[PDB]
């Protein structure tokens, strides 16, 4: 009845500085279906963003994928901020470039 | 193609 979201932040292609890429937040295995998901570039929510659309898997849990077009640079910090009912605080997981 | 009828619990 109550299942915590599994978050994964990572690029479409191997991140290369100064070259176009996509950022992916994969929020998965979460239940119920209500969920707020935010992508962050150095603190602020970035507006120009579509997700996929809500769906769910074999075990009855939901999942989504949000994304942006973006170009990696050595100084810029990127993150994913997801909120669900199962957690007191909105979880902010930062994007590791080799992860 | 989706299955036409749905069943009532």
């Amino acid at each position: 009845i109550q299942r915590t979201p599994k978050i994964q932040v990572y690029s479409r292609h191997p991140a290369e500085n100064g070259k176009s890429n996509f950022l992916n937040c994969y929020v998965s295995g979460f239940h119920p279906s209500d969920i707020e998901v935010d992508l962050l570039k150095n603190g602020e929510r970035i507006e120009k963003v579509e997700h996929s659309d809500l769906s769910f898997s074999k075990d009855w849990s939901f999942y989504l994928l949000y994304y942006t077009e973006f170009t990696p640079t050595e100084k810029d910090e990127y993150a994913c901020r997801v909120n669900h009912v199962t957690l007191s605080q909105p979880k902010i997981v930062k994007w590791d470039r080799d992860m | 193609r989706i299955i036409p009828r749905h069943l009532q619990l």
Partner: protein
């Protein structure tokens, strides 16, 4: 690793708001090809893979007309369900449902199944024999009897055995290009010294079935190897990795090897 068709549906009541939200969607293997949302400006079944755009308007009108009749039942199903478990009209609730056929050696199905879950936990499932149902509790036990008095598991066997396999094939051929051609992974390995760790990447592959494996000096060592969840890339492909901390000295003595039906390739740093 056989081909599969799955229709996934979910109904979540939003108490205080309006009618319950309904999303239905179809998957051939790991590829969503169709979707429905009562929340979309024009709730109507519509394509989500190029090979399906191909189907005609009457096909759409019927798929949409049918799933539209699904939502109505599940709206009614939610109330029924809230009355079995004796549940105040104030909490949000979710009823989900799925139906699928899995392909045998030749054409004909290997496994068929339809099942329901209420608020996360299982509820009512069609048995293997496609002729009976297992209920989760007294509540679902009521549904079993309804189904049983309604002789309904035939109607359901009918689809699973006929329609399901039939269209599974139609869509498979009409999408041989993407559904039947495997994308093999562009693998490699990366370093990153902490002390040192070793990460084995597999990118841009279809389907998402893959096993990953690192070899110490001989065979399988999987006591501290990191097991990251296999993730969508965003295009039709997938992504995964496994990684190990090795004492910074014997590094090319570790080999991560990976199989995928698109022979079992073996690779190192």
């Amino acid at each position: 690793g056989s081909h599969s068709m799955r229709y996934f549906s979910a109904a979540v009541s939003r108490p205080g708001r309006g009618e319950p939200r309904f999303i239905a969607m179809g998957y051939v293997d790991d590829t969503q090809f169709v979707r429905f949302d009562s929340d979309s400006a024009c709730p109507r079944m519509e394509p989500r893979a190029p090979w399906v755009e191909q189907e005609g308007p009457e096909y759409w009108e019927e798929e949409t007309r049918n799933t539209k009749a699904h939502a109505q039942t599940d709206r009614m199903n939610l109330q029924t369900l809230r009355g079995y478990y004796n549940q105040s009209e104030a909490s949000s609730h979710t009823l989900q449902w799925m139906i699928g056929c899995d392909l045998g050696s030749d054409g004909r199905l290997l496994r068929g199944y339809e099942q329901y879950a209420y608020d996360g936990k299982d509820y009512l499932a069609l048995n293997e024999d496609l002729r009976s149902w297992t209920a989760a509790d007294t509540a679902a036990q009521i549904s079993k009897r309804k189904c049983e008095a309604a002789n309904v598991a035939e109607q359901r066997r009918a689809y699973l055995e006929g329609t399901c396999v039939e269209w599974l094939h139609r869509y498979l051929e009409n999408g041989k290009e993407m559904l039947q051609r495997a994308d093999p992974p562009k693998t490699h390995v990366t370093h990153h010294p902490v002390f040192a760790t070793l990460r084995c990447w597999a990118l841009g592959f279809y389907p998402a079935e893959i096993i990953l494996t690192w070899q110490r000096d001989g065979e399988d060592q999987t006591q501290d190897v990191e097991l990251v969840e296999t993730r969508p890339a965003g295009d039709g492909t997938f992504q995964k990795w496994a990684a190990v901390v090795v004492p910074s000295g014997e590094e090319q003595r570790y080999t991560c090897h990976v199989q995928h039906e698109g022979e079992p390739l073996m690779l190192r740093w």
